[PDB]
Amino acid sequence: MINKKSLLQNLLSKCKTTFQQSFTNANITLKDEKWLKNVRTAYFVCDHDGSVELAYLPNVLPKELVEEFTEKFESIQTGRKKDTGYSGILDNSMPFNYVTADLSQELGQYLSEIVNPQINYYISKLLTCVSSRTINYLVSLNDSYYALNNCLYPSTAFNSLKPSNDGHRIRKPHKDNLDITPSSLFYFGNFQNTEGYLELTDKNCKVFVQPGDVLFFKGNEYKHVVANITSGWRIGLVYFAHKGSKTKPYYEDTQKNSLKIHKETK
DNA sequence: AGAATTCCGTTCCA
DNA sequence: TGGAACGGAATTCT
Numbered sequence A: 001m002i003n004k005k006s007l008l009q010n011l012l013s014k015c016k017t018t019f020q021q022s023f024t025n026a027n028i029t030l031k032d033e034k035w036l037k038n039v040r041t042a043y044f045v046c047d048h049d050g051s052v053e054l055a056y057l058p059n060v061l062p063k064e065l066v067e068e069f070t071e072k073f074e075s076i077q078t079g080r081k082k083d084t085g086y087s088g089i090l091d092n093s094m095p096f097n098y099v100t101a102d103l104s105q106e107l108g109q110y111l112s113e114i115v116n117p118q119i120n121y122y123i124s125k126l127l128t129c130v131s132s133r134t135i136n137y138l139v140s141l142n143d144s145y146y147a148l149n150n151c152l153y154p155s156t157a158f159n160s161l162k163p164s165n166d167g168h169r170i171r172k173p174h175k176d177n178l179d180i181t182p183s184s185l186f187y188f189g190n191f192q193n194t195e196g197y198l199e200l201t202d203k204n205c206k207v208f209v210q211p212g213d214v215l216f217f218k219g220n221e222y223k224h225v226v227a228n229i230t231s232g233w234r235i236g237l238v239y240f241a242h243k244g245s246k247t248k249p250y251y252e253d254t255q256k257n258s259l260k261i262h263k264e265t266k
Numbered sequence B: 001a002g003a004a005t006t007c008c009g010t011t012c013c014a
Numbered sequence C: 001t002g003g004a005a006c007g008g009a010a011t012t013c014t
């Protein structure tokens, strides 16, 4: 119900001035139409209403930032058993929001205190361009969430993918169904141009992501999976918000403690 | 103690 | 519907 050529011109205009980069060979498709099979460049997916359900902007992060974060991420993850980590709040399995167990650890500290305040700026950049509805929602959240995660997004996921790990949750095709808003994704580490791509299975679209790129898309609606890497290290951050952020209460404590607090108020 | 297993609890889907 | 799934443990075995 709208012109895609003009909408792309609008999005490109905002993104060019905001990120101060020229995005060549940018493309736009409606969600109903046939998506590009291979996206190495700027790409946008919209509905009939005009809202952006996917945005991919190549290399918006300064190389100095990607390299420093990578080195620290790899340093911390070495001393970690699990291949995933989380900062901010999680409502998973509980009818309340709770502080992640990792926030007290080295990973959670580095994300919240150092990484997130810097990344929060590029998130602000991204949202003011592609989605107004998202940032309008994120600023309505409890102040405690913003203070906790030091970011507009109340929750941050840390995905460490080493070569030939098929057991990682991002290696299995899925949807994140708790998400009330499209997530913002940042990538780090080093891996090849032909591997570690995010594939949307139902739309048959392969987005090839490299360190420094940003990806903004709905995780609940579109089933997606991360491809295997034969070399390098694939590290990425997922900034999201669940439904429980608005709906469920907050006791300002970790999971087990909050459960005790939750019951005693009932 | 340091392994394997069960548990609390929400949400979904083949 | 059983059971896996962006958690995070406590029990229960060797």
Ligand SMILES: O=C(O)CCC(=O)C(=O)O
Binding pocket: A157, A159, A169, A170, A176, A185, A198, A224, A225, A226, A236, A238
């Ligand atoms: O890292 C990616 O490219 C995707 C992450 C993802 O799908 C998830 O965290 O569920």
Ligand SMILES: [Mn+2]
Binding pocket: A174, A175, A176, A219, A224
């Ligand atoms: Mn996902």
